[PDB]
Design an enzyme around this catalytic site. Sequence first.
Site, PDB file in Angstrom:
ATOM      1  CE  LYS A 115     -26.394  23.465 -13.026  1.00 11.38           C
ATOM      2  NZ  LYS A 115     -26.347  21.995 -13.263  1.00 11.38           N
ATOM      3  N   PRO A 116     -23.183  24.245 -18.002  1.00 13.04           N
ATOM      4  CG  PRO A 116     -21.153  23.523 -17.104  1.00 13.04           C
ATOM      5  CD  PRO A 116     -22.233  24.598 -16.946  1.00 13.04           C
TER       6      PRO A 116
ATOM      7  CG  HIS B  37     -25.410  17.257  -5.894  1.00 15.03           C
ATOM      8  ND1 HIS B  37     -25.381  18.105  -6.981  1.00 15.03           N
ATOM      9  CD2 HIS B  37     -24.259  16.555  -5.978  1.00 15.03           C
ATOM     10  CE1 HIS B  37     -24.267  17.939  -7.672  1.00 15.03           C
ATOM     11  NE2 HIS B  37     -23.561  17.004  -7.071  1.00 15.03           N
ATOM     12  CG  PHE B  38     -29.135  14.406 -10.875  1.00 16.52           C
ATOM     13  CD1 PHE B  38     -28.197  13.904 -11.784  1.00 16.52           C
ATOM     14  CD2 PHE B  38     -30.427  13.901 -10.834  1.00 16.52           C
ATOM     15  CE1 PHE B  38     -28.545  12.869 -12.674  1.00 16.52           C
ATOM     16  CE2 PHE B  38     -30.802  12.874 -11.683  1.00 16.52           C
ATOM     17  CZ  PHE B  38     -29.861  12.376 -12.607  1.00 16.52           C
ATOM     18  CG  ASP B  39     -23.226  11.659  -7.206  1.00 12.23           C
ATOM     19  OD1 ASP B  39     -22.482  12.622  -6.958  1.00 12.23           O
ATOM     20  OD2 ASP B  39     -22.769  10.507  -7.327  1.00 12.23           O
TER      21      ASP B  39
ATOM     22  CG  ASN C 165     -29.557  20.951 -15.219  1.00 14.29           C
ATOM     23  OD1 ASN C 165     -29.064  21.033 -14.098  1.00 14.29           O
ATOM     24  ND2 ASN C 165     -30.859  20.954 -15.434  1.00 14.29           N
ATOM     25  CB  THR C 166     -29.675  15.101 -15.361  1.00 12.84           C
ATOM     26  OG1 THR C 166     -28.329  14.932 -15.914  1.00 12.84           O
ATOM     27  CG2 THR C 166     -30.525  13.891 -15.801  1.00 12.84           C
TER      28      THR C 166
ATOM     29  CE  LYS D 220     -28.458  26.913  -6.144  1.00 20.32           C
ATOM     30  NZ  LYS D 220     -29.318  27.904  -5.447  1.00 20.32           N
TER      31      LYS D 220
ATOM     32  NE  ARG E 254     -33.790  27.944  -9.498  1.00 17.63           N
ATOM     33  CZ  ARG E 254     -32.569  28.134  -9.979  1.00 17.63           C
ATOM     34  NH1 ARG E 254     -32.382  28.210 -11.293  1.00 17.63           N
ATOM     35  NH2 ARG E 254     -31.511  28.274  -9.174  1.00 17.63           N
TER      36      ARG E 254
ATOM     37  CE  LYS F 250     -19.178  11.085 -11.296  1.00 13.19           C
ATOM     38  NZ  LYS F 250     -19.795  10.975 -12.674  1.00 13.19           N
TER      39      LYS F 250
ATOM     40  CG  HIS G  29     -31.568  18.476 -11.052  1.00  8.27           C
ATOM     41  ND1 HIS G  29     -30.712  18.178 -12.095  1.00  8.27           N
ATOM     42  CD2 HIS G  29     -30.849  19.226 -10.185  1.00  8.27           C
ATOM     43  CE1 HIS G  29     -29.524  18.680 -11.838  1.00  8.27           C
ATOM     44  NE2 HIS G  29     -29.564  19.330 -10.685  1.00  8.27           N
TER      45      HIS G  29
HETATM   46  C1  LIG Z   1     -28.318  19.901 -10.084  1.00  4.77           C
HETATM   47  C2  LIG Z   1     -28.394  20.141  -8.596  1.00  4.77           C
HETATM   48  O1  LIG Z   1     -28.447  19.046  -8.119  1.00  4.77           O
HETATM   49  N1  LIG Z   1     -28.393  21.333  -8.036  1.00  4.77           N
HETATM   50  C3  LIG Z   1     -28.232  21.660  -6.645  1.00  4.77           C
HETATM   51  C4  LIG Z   1     -27.073  22.672  -6.550  1.00  4.77           C
HETATM   52  N2  LIG Z   1     -25.759  22.082  -6.783  1.00  4.77           N
HETATM   53  C5  LIG Z   1     -25.146  21.343  -5.757  1.00  4.77           C
HETATM   54  C6  LIG Z   1     -25.769  21.155  -4.522  1.00  4.77           C
HETATM   55  C7  LIG Z   1     -25.133  20.395  -3.540  1.00  4.77           C
HETATM   56  C8  LIG Z   1     -23.866  19.846  -3.766  1.00  4.77           C
HETATM   57  C9  LIG Z   1     -23.219  20.049  -4.997  1.00  4.77           C
HETATM   58  C10 LIG Z   1     -21.944  19.519  -5.279  1.00  4.77           C
HETATM   59  S1  LIG Z   1     -21.002  18.568  -4.087  1.00  4.77           S
HETATM   60  O2  LIG Z   1     -19.800  18.033  -4.792  1.00  4.77           O
HETATM   61  O3  LIG Z   1     -21.585  17.515  -3.180  1.00  4.77           O
HETATM   62  O4  LIG Z   1     -20.520  19.619  -3.095  1.00  4.77           O
HETATM   63  C11 LIG Z   1     -21.344  19.735  -6.521  1.00  4.77           C
HETATM   64  C12 LIG Z   1     -21.996  20.504  -7.488  1.00  4.77           C
HETATM   65  C13 LIG Z   1     -23.268  21.031  -7.218  1.00  4.77           C
HETATM   66  C14 LIG Z   1     -23.877  20.797  -5.980  1.00  4.77           C
HETATM   67 CL   LIG Z   2     -26.867  17.274 -13.514  1.00  6.68          CL
HETATM   68 CL   LIG Z   3     -35.409  31.202 -10.648  1.00  4.97          CL
END
Ligand SMILES: *CC(=O)NCCNc1cccc2c(S(=O)(=O)O)cccc12
Ligand SMILES: [Cl-]
Ligand SMILES: [Cl-]
Length: 123
Positions: free
Chosen positions: A40-41, A118-120, A43-44, A6, A9, A65, A11
């Site tokens: 999706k509002p 996850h992209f922070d 995305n990087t 995920k 796909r 964060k 990022h």
């Molecule tokens: C953009 C991206 O990184 N996608 C992966 C799906 N979104 C996502 C995954 C894991 C955690 C998370 C969090 S969190 O605050 O650590 O729980 C917040 C928004 C999206 C994700």
């Molecule tokens: Cl992002």
């Molecule tokens: Cl897909």
Amino acid sequence: ETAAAKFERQHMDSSTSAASSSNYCNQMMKSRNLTKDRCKPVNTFVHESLADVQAVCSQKNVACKNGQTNCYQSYSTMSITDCRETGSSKYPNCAYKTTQANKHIIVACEGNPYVPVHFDASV
Ligand SMILES: *CC(=O)NCCNc1cccc2c(S(=O)(=O)O)cccc12
Ligand SMILES: [Cl-]
Ligand SMILES: [Cl-]
Ligand SMILES: [Cl-]
């Protein structure tokens, strides 16, 4: 979809070194299926090899964060494109502003192998 897949796909865009034009975000948000059931509002996209992004999980450990401590900041700056919905945009006619930049990325890592999930943020 697995957490690693995920992340990939949503990022990774290793086929271009930098956002082409002002329409890059419109094109990419749609082809990666991020406009499917809603707009999706924010995305990087990262323009570096998958290997280089995966290597961040062994770089500088920092807090997320959200407060967790499985985040890592890239030692070096990376080519990224921030995609953000414009004040106008409304499903299903999603519209995005494209902003190209070179910044450090911050990602949350997990699993075995230990990879980005996850992209922070970027700095
Ligand atoms: C953009 C991206 O990184 N996608 C992966 C799906 N979104 C996502 C995954 C894991 C955690 C998370 C969090 S969190 O605050 O650590 O729980 C917040 C928004 C999206 C994700
Ligand atoms: Cl992002
Ligand atoms: Cl897909
Ligand atoms: Cl996977």
